[PDB]
């Protein structure tokens, strides 16, 4: 049973066993009844090289399990920066949502992965609300993570349509003087954004 062997080797990080299983015609996109594929297990376990091989042989980069998790979800949840970069480089939907409406940005913000949040925003990650109506910034505020709230408020302020350059740079400079106030400045910015619309 080559599919099961490929799933086991993908989860255990056995690179040469994955190569040999591929050489015998194992299905790159073999999924168990939960919808979990070898790319899922390699992105979850943190095996970058197996991610690169699987993607090289045609692994579905946007395969979702019965919970709605894509491999990008798993890489963001478990803090695998380089696997996030590799999956995005191979066309992963940066805005994929799970059963709870959560994007990889939500899961990366949940654990305070600053670099993964940066990489996701570089690839055009969108600000979305989960089932609880919460954004990645809200998650940043529920936790005591000042840096993450500062970055996410930087991006929210950066993308407001009705602020002019002097106001936007004033809010950004106000995000570098005291980051503890990142939650208040964004609200001030949003009020101004809606007064000039």
Residue numbers in the entry: 13 to 209
From the paper:
The second example we chose was a fusion of an artificial ankyrin protein (designed ankyrin repeat protein (DARPin)) and the protein A domain3. The DARPin protein, mbp3-16, had been previously selected by ribosome display from a large library of mutant ankyrin repeat proteins as a protein that binds to maltose-binding protein (MBP). The fusion helix was formed by superimposing 6 amino acids of the C- and N-terminal helices of the ankyrin and protein A domains, respectively. The crystal structure shows that the two helices were fused into a long continuous helix with nearly ideal helical geometry Figure 2 Fusions of DARPin-protein A, PKA_RIIα-protein A and PKA_RIIα-DHR14 by the shared helix method. (a) Crystal structure of the DARPin-protein A fusion protein. In comparison, the fusion proteins PKA_RIIα-protein A, MrsD-protein A and DARPin-protein A ligated by the shared helix method have negligible structural flexibility at the fusion sites.
Here, we propose a method for generating proteins and protein complexes with complicated shapes using fusions of alpha helices. To design amino acid sequences that can stabilize the alpha helical structure of the fusion sites, we superimposed one or two turns of terminal alpha helices of connecting proteins using a molecular graphics program. Then, the amino acid residues important for forming a fused helical structure were chosen from the two natural sequences in the superimposed region.
